DNA sequence: TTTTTATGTACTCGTAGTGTCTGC
DNA sequence: GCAGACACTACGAGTACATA
């Protein structure tokens, strides 16, 4: 930083004028800001019995169908659109639901399961090792934990935790915490 | 038949026009761009002793670069192409002359409309600069009774206005006004000096490059203007 | 004769593809609307869409260019990706047609979903090059053409003739077939078989010709070949009689007989019961057979699933 | 005259594309917002989006430039990739203007998806280069323009005119159509015809003119051509009428007609019955057609399985 | 022999796959229609579809090419994605067949849903290359072939012989099997067992041979082996008895037993309950079983869907 | 009796080596011995449906008793491109040892597998000399007919 | 007061890593 | 001779689509 009179140019001017596109890249990347998904405006239109505002937009038969699945009162008409959904106008599918799901309201939270992803690991690593599927892999964990303590099985198998396998189990640094955890208390 | 580094040369050129080629028995080869933007023709040393269709012209020119100059090209008993090098033999396909785009007959130019020339040296200076200067469109017009070429960059000025480049080609003897516009994309011809015969009739028109070795004929573009 | 033969090919629905716009069999207003164009001497942008195949789209695309002496470039739609447009199609369109000809780019079968982005690049292209060059599009399903492209084009919609046109167009095809027969050495013993071919698969004049190819196995169309085309293999009398009598031992027995072509038998049944039963029993027989038809092919044992239709009928169906 | 003719072209909806910002038919507020801009003399960053095609977007862009005597680079949106923005777009902005001319860049049809990177890249290009030049963007779907751009830009939405802007704008266009008929040599015997073209196509002026081309085939717009423009669309009328009347002989007959493209016909049916039937009959027509659609392709005889749909509808569907 | 042996393989229903078109066991008109082609010496576009497997499609595809001396390329349908067509298939078809042979591309088992887009690219291809080259398609389920492709092809439909052809074709297979026996060293003590194999799984000539393989365990077909082939069970007594008694623990247990051939078991059930139950319980058992039959093959767990039939019956069926 | 002495789970280390060690009913054991008799294996589908009967075991066995060069693969893992890449890389390959190649697919009656199963129609035919396929199923109907045609279907 | 199912296929964009052709 | 520069390849990310 010489010359000491430079009318500080913004992040972008520096980049572009000098022409280093990786600076240009961090700069552009700055606007990444990605969400959208007005899906609930369509969904809430079907609950609260309001004006459509559609076919102009991008409709997910699955988003809607699934969002409505949250509420037992809708199921009869969500189900109907299941067996019959394929081959309905993206629009027809919206016209039905509107003429089907009677009351309206919903607050957000969708149902997801509990994953002890310690436990998800142990099961996928039995499933891989023995080329058996998940339900059997289960029986496996039990008769090992029950008898043979399966530290040994965990001991012999740890060898392949291959970090790509990890890409299948969970999505983040919690993954890198497992990388260590199975490599540990056997 | 046997092909010489001279002719293998003139072909790598016709590969920049049509990916394929039609060659019928003789001393004469023509090709034309699939979209009819460019037509090339030439007379050659090596003598062409059977007809055939070549789908891949540039990849077979690639495979003939691996044998000796003495290599004997023959139709294969099995009808494809046999290249016999001394210690070796290569086998290359033939397609039917339906899938390669041949012109019918060797399109003869009309009586020209205006004529100039260009030196080998000065062709270099055009092509080679276009890249740097981003000259994607050029125009042959008259300036001070002396014909000049003009480079432009069509994306920058759609109107062919700020002329980024110019090369004076010789004196203009007759009296007519013209702007002929050629797409740099059609300039596929190899380097060297060319007699330049251009012709125009209204919404008709064309530009023939008459070389020493082969002839080239290139379409003009539609914003081209003239009275002829 | 008045007919075009390509003579470079053997496949016969393609040997006889029409050369000019007059040869094409078209609805009244559609012909007129093309002759009109071939007159103005210049071609607008045009979309020609079926969705029933073989109504003449890809023929008329080629036709129009012929009748105007276009300088034409034909392209497989599915080969027409974006960089194709950028390089060759753009070179072609920017090229001065030097002998003063309309340039026309025919993009055949452009309705693939994947080509959306190519069609988008195209929307500003068709405007830039509109003086020199025009685009003819063929598609089976329009909705695969982005709206902005349908704005830019004259959209002509094939194969929806009026009740009046259908009858006339068919009559025109019967003649056109006859003249193909004369040419190919097929002899026609019964004309009813030429008519029945045309009616059978109407909207589509391609399979209509290649059906003539494959029913010419023996080099004559006689009233025997007529049996196969119209095909009724039928004597349904045995089942109809057992249904009247409302017995089973007989029906239960007939089921495995028709298990063979179920699709045909269900037709011949709906056809002949419709006349033989009461009006409000007609509304039921469709509910009964129509349902049985739906689930066929899910049904494990076809023979049994056919029995279940017979019982269902004998009970609810009524007549004298 | 007052009208622009390009005279370099024959395609007529493009021969007559307006030159200035006045020539345009725009809603009140928008037109003024545009004059006001060409007044203050320098052009702000603008995004122009329809989404109905042919509302004037790309025309109003070219005009603002003519009215500012701007130095313009017109680019194909689909051609504008990251390297263009780095390249000849920066080359342009940074290179010098001694004309004292607003430097404007028109990016036409910028709504493609994969341009996300070219877009983020521009939104920054704007901060570094904003004071050399300015950017007008044409789009059909705005959503295809990253949100950071809609921010920095004035976003004017064509196509959604007030109720009064509908009424005046059409008048302005009826007048405009008549003027094109003066030049092209078309005679107007019945004017109700020029009003028909305009009402029928309204939001889209491009097809609106094009349809003027295709209906001038004979050279006069007369009371008979009225009957064609106005005449009432869909050919599903025969089935819709038979369903109202709850008869069979007719429905039973129409089935083999639409057996051809079932997938299309079922669409056109769901589309046109949805308006023509009672609200709780709407919930049933979907159950009825939605099921019939599921099992199609299992169904042996497609023609029959289509009949079974017709009967099912005529019974349960009720309406006036 | 008169018979073809491939001798490069042991799997016997494939050792004996017919070399020529004469060897194939085909319906009257279907043979005739192929001999006709092999004459003209050029092959059209052809679709050969079952949907019952092992009727001779993939054999006749290879056959026809032999009887014409085609220059042939065989392809797995599912391997036939779009870029395959673009590169290899297109190279092949554009290649001059230099020895003057028909080029024929056999695309075996092309009915996958995923191949739709490849089939679309294909529609313009089959037209461009129609002089040089033709395409033979095999599919189990037609509806997996886009309509525009069925237009372009002669669609021959296997496995629906007439009442006459069935009888003839079977007779031909009994001879064909006998000759295989001579060749493999299997000896036939009772011919009734060779006839019963053919009838038992008729439409399908493949499992018809591989059934001959597995009933030759002891190297002779005696009237003892005849017992097993014609066998089935007939022992439905266990289920019938549990249904009378209206219990579950037993029925619930029998379900997984008959889960194997559901189609057969449902037949033997309708057969034997029809006599053993009351008249108005007969009308219900058909409704109950008829429905259970329809939805089979939609049903996820066949075993359970069979249990649901047992419960349904035990409740409503009332009889002594 | 066989022991696999590197394995930690009972059922996996006591799995019967031969078509003998297995406990089966009458026409079952006969029909299996009758098969290994011919020294080359056809296509085969095996199904219980009552599980734990030995399905998956009898497969690894029939291979053993033929000195088959056997590739074992779980069905759940048999995706479309698995078939394309390895299983094809396998059946396309000739063997030095000149044995029969065989592919056991355990429990192929799962769901997404559906489109894979269709790829095989024309595969099981295209290498029908080299190698053959043994398929295991708890429910048959979950195996598309055109496979049941290509395979000998024994039922336990 | 919300928020992403499975399996296969296709097109386009961007960049980085590989090549060959060229210039002291 | 190398190093520099140009061109062509491939993989990763994004996007969209259809059938179950
Ligand atoms: N017929 C049998 N004889 C001996 N052990 C058996 C038998 N069937 C199953 N097993 C035991 O089951 C284990 C594996 O069973 P498996 O074949 O996977 O059953 P399934 O195929 O029904 O899943 C073997 O280790 C074996 O000891
Ligand atoms: Mg076509
Ligand atoms: Mg536009
Ligand atoms: Mg097959
Ligand atoms: Mg198992």
Q: Does domain F1-156 have CATH number 3.40.80.10?
A: no
E123 is an annotated ligand-binding site residue: no
E41 is an annotated ligand-binding site residue: no
Q: Is the peptide bond before B183 cis (omega within 30 degrees of 0)?
A: no
Q: Could you give the count of Cα atoms lying within 13 Å of A25 in the half-sphere of its Cβ?
A: 4
Interface of C with D in 207-226 (CB under 8 A): none
Length of chain C: 320
Q: Which atom of ligand 1 is nearest to the CA of F53?
A: 8
Q: Ligand 1, atom 24: nearest CA belongs to which residue?
A: F15
Strand (E) or helix (H) holding C34: helix C28-40
Measure the CA–CA gap between E130 and C210, rounded to whole angstroms.
14
Within chain E, all domains assigned CATH 3.40.50.300 are found at: 1-162
Query: What is the token pair recorded at B56?
Result: 């891949």
Please tell me the experimental approach by which this structure was elucidated. Answer: X-ray
CATH number at residue B57: 3.70.10.10
Measure the CA–CA gap between D178 and D169, rounded to whole angstroms.
14
Within chain E, all domains assigned CATH 1.10.8.60 are found at: 163-229
Are residues D92 and B156, on separate chains, in Cβ contact within 8 Å? yes
Q: For the domain covering C163-229, report its CATH number.
A: 1.10.8.60
Measure the CA–CA gap between B137 and E259, rounded to whole angstroms.
76
F12 touches chain E (CB under 8 A): no
Q: What is the DSSP letter of E16?
A: S
F18 is an annotated ligand-binding site residue: no
Kindly determine whether the C-beta of residue F114 is less than 7 Å away from any atom of nucleic acid strand H: yes
Work out how many domains chain B is built from and give that number.
Answer: 1
What's the Å distance between residue E263 CA and nucleotide G21 C1'? 71
Contact exists between F and A (3 or more beta carbon pairs < 8 Å): yes
Strands D71-76 and D103-108: parallel
Quote the ligand 5 centre to F55 CA distance (angstroms).
Answer: 7
State the helix-helix crossing angle for D237-244 and D262-276, rounded to 10 degrees.
Answer: 50
Kindly determine whether the C-beta of residue F3 is less than 7 Å away from any atom of nucleic acid strand H: no
Site to substitute for ligand 1 among F21, F32, F55, F57, most atoms within 8 A of C-beta: F57
Query: What is the token pair recorded at B106?
Result: 């060797």
Three-class SS state of B19: coil
Q: Which atom of ligand 1 is nearest to the CA of F57?
A: 17
Runs of H (alpha helix) within chain E: 28-40, 57-67, 82-84, 90-94, 116-128, 147-152, 163-184, 192-200, 205-214, 225-229, 237-244, 249-258, 262-276, 279-295, 302-316
Distance from the Cα of B144 to chain C's closest Cα (Å) equals: 27
Q: For the domain covering E230-320, report its CATH number.
A: 1.20.272.10
- Report yes or no: F127 and F94 within 8 Å, Cβ to Cβ: no
Q: Which residues of A touch D (CB under 8 A)?
A: 10-13, 15-17, 21, 24, 27-33, 36, 56, 58, 80-81, 83-89, 92, 95-96, 99-100
CATH of A35-112, picked from 1.10.1740.10, 3.40.50.720, 2.40.40.20, 1.20.272.50, is: 1.20.272.50
Name the residue with tokens 């012709």.
Answer: B199
Q: What is the resolution of this structure in A?
A: 3.5
Measure the CA–CA gap between E34 and E64, rounded to whole angstroms.
7
Parse chain A into domains and list their residue ranges: 1-34, 35-112, 113-186
- Report yes or no: B33 and B39 within 8 Å, Cβ to Cβ: yes
Q: For the domain covering A1-34, report its CATH number.
A: 6.10.250.1260
Strand (E) or helix (H) holding B117: strand B114-118
Length of chain F: 156
Our answer on whether the CB atom of F28 is closer than 6 Å to any ligand 1 atom is no
- Please name the residue of chain C whose CA is at the shortest distance from the CA of residue B17: C88
Runs of H (alpha helix) within chain A: 11-18, 21-28, 39-47, 61-69, 75-83, 90-100, 117-130, 134-146, 151-157, 163-169, 173-181
Runs of H (alpha helix) within chain F: 10-13, 26-36, 55-65, 80-82, 88-91, 114-120, 145-150
Q: Ligand 1, atom 1: nearest CA belongs to which residue?
A: F23
How far, in Å, are C8, E100, F65 from residue C15 at the CA level? 8, 20, 60
Please list every residue in chain B whose beta carbon sits closer than 8 Å to the beta carbon of residue E87.
none
Name the residue with tokens 């007559």.
Answer: D16
Three-class SS state of E74: strand
Please list every residue in chain B whose beta carbon sits closer than 8 Å to the beta carbon of residue D74.
158
Measure the CA–CA gap between D266 and D262, rounded to whole angstroms.
6
Architecture per CATH, A113-186 = Orthogonal Bundle (1.10)
Q: How many CB atoms lie within 10 A of CB D168?
A: 14
Kindly determine whether the C-beta of residue C298 is less than 7 Å away from any atom of nucleic acid strand H: no
Q: Which of C84, C113, C250, C299 to mutate to test the interface with E (most CBs of E within 10 A)?
A: C299
What's the Å distance between residue E315 CA and nucleotide H4 C1'? 88
Ligand nearest to the CA of F60: 1
Q: Does domain C1-162 have CATH number 3.30.70.600?
A: no
Kindly determine whether the C-beta of residue D114 is less than 7 Å away from any atom of nucleic acid strand H: yes
Are residues B219 and C88, on separate chains, in Cβ contact within 8 Å? no
Are residues B222 and C132, on separate chains, in Cβ contact within 8 Å? yes
Site to substitute for ligand 1 among F19, F50, F54, F64, most atoms within 8 A of C-beta: F54
Three-class SS state of B202: coil
Kindly determine whether the C-beta of residue F112 is less than 7 Å away from any atom of nucleic acid strand H: no
Strand (E) or helix (H) holding D181: helix D163-184
Query: What is the token pair recorded at C147?
Result: 């709206």
Strands B81-84 and B72-75: antiparallel
Measure the CA–CA gap between E38 and E136, rounded to whole angstroms.
14
How far, in Å, are A18, B154, F61 from residue D86 at the CA level? 12, 17, 66
Among the listed residues E85, A154, F75, the one whose alpha carbon sits nearest the alpha carbon of residue C79:
E85
Q: Could you give the count of Cα atoms lying within 13 Å of D306 in the half-sphere of its Cβ?
A: 21
Query: What is the token pair recorded at D81?
Result: 């990739």
Our answer on whether the CB atom of F98 is closer than 6 Å to any ligand 1 atom is no
Query: What is the token pair recorded at E181?
Result: 């026996």
Residues facing C187 on adjacent strands: C220
């Amino acid at each position: 930083s010489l010359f000491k009179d430079d009318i500080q140019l913004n992040e972008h001017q520096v980049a572009w004028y000098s022409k280093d596109w990786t600076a240009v890249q961090s700069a552009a990347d700055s606007f990444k800001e990605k969400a959208e998904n007005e899906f609930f405006e369509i969904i809430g239109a079907i609950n609260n019995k309001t004006k459509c505002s559609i076919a102009q937009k991008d409709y997910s038969k699955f988003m809607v169908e699934n969002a409505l699945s949250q509420f037992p009162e809708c199921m009869p008409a969500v189900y109907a659109m299941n067996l019959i959904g394929s081959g309905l106008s993206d629009e027809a599918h919206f016209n039905y639901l509107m003429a089907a799901v009677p009351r309206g309201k919903r607050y957000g939270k969708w149902a997801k399961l509990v994953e002890d992803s310690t436990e998800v690991l142990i099961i996928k690593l039995l499933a891989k090792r023995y080329q058996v599927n998940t339900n059997d892999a289960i029986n496996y964990k039990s008769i090992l934990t029950k008898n043979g303590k399966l530290p040994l099985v965990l001991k012999e198998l740890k060898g392949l935790v291959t970090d790509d396998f990890l890409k299948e189990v969970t999505k983040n640094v919690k993954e890198q915490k497992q990388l260590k955890k199975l490599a540990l208390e056997w | 038949m046997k092909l010489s580094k001279d002719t293998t040369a003139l072909l790598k050129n016709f590969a920049t026009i049509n990916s394929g080629i039609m060659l019928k028995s003789g001393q004469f080869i023509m090709t034309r761009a699939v979209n009819g933007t460019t037509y090339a023709e030439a007379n050659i040393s090596d003598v062409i002793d059977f007809d055939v269709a070549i789908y891949d012209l540039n990849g077979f020119l690639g495979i003939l670069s691996l044998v000796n100059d003495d290599a004997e090209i023959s139709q294969s008993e099995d009808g494809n192409i046999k290249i016999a090098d001394a210690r070796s033999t290569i086998f290359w396909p033939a397609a039917d002359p339906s899938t390669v785009v041949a012109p019918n007959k060797p399109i003869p130019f009309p009586v020209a409309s205006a004529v100039t020339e260009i030196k080998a040296e000065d062709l270099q200076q055009l092509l080679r600069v276009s890249r740097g200067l981003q000259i994607d469109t050029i125009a042959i017009t008259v300036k001070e009774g002396k014909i000049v070429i003009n480079g432009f960059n069509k994306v920058e000025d759609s109107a062919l206005t700020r002329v980024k480049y110019s090369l004076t080609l010789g004196d203009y003897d007759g009296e007519n006004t013209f702007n002929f516009i050629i797409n740099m994309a059609n300039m596929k011809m190899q380097p060297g000096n060319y007699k330049l015969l251009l012709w125009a009739k209204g919404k008709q028109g064309a530009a023939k490059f008459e070389g020493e070795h082969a002839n080239y004929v290139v379409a003009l573009e539609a914003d081209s203007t003239h009275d002829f | 004769s008045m007919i075009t033969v390509n003579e470079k090919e053997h496949i016969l629905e393609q040997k006889y593809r029409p050369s000019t716009i007059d040869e094409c069999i078209l609805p009244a207003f559609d012909k007129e609307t093309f002759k009109s164009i071939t007159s103005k001497g210049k071609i607008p942008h045009i979309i020609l869409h079926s969705p029933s195949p073989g109504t003449g789209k890809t023929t008329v695309a080629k036709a129009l260019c012929h009748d105007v002496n276009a300088d034409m470039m034909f392209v497989n739609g599915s080969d027409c990706k974006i960089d194709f447009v950028r390089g060759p199609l753009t070179n072609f369109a920017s090229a001065a047609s030097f002998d003063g000809r309309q340039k026309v780019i025919v993009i055949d079968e452009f309705d693939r979903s994947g080509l959306a982005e190519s069609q988008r690049h195209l929307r500003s292209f068709m405007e830039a090059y509109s003086s020199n060059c025009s685009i003819i599009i063929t598609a089976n399903n329009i909705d695969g053409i982005i709206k902005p492209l349908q704005s830019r084009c004259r959209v002509i919609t094939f194969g929806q003739p009026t009740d009046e046109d259908k009858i006339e167009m068919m009559k025109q095809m019967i003649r056109r077939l006859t003249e193909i027969c004369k040419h190919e050495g097929i002899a026609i013993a019964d004309m009813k078989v030429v008519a029945a071919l045309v009616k059978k698969n109407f909207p589509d004049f391609r399979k209509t010709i290649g059906e003539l190819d494959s029913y010419s196995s023996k080099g004559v169309l006689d009233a025997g070949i007529l049996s196969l085309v119209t095909n009724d293999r039928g004597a349904i009398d045995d089942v109809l009689e057992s249904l009247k009598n409302k017995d089973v031992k007989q029906l239960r027995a007939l089921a495995p007989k028709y298990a063979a072509d179920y699709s045909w038998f269900v037709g011949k049944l709906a056809e002949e019961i419709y006349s033989r039963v009461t009006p409000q029993s007609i509304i039921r027989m469709y509910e009964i057979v129509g349902e049985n038809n739906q689930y066929h092919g899910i049904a494990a044992n076809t023979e049994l699933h056919l029995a279940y239709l017979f019982i269902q009928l004998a009970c609810e169906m009524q007549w004298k």
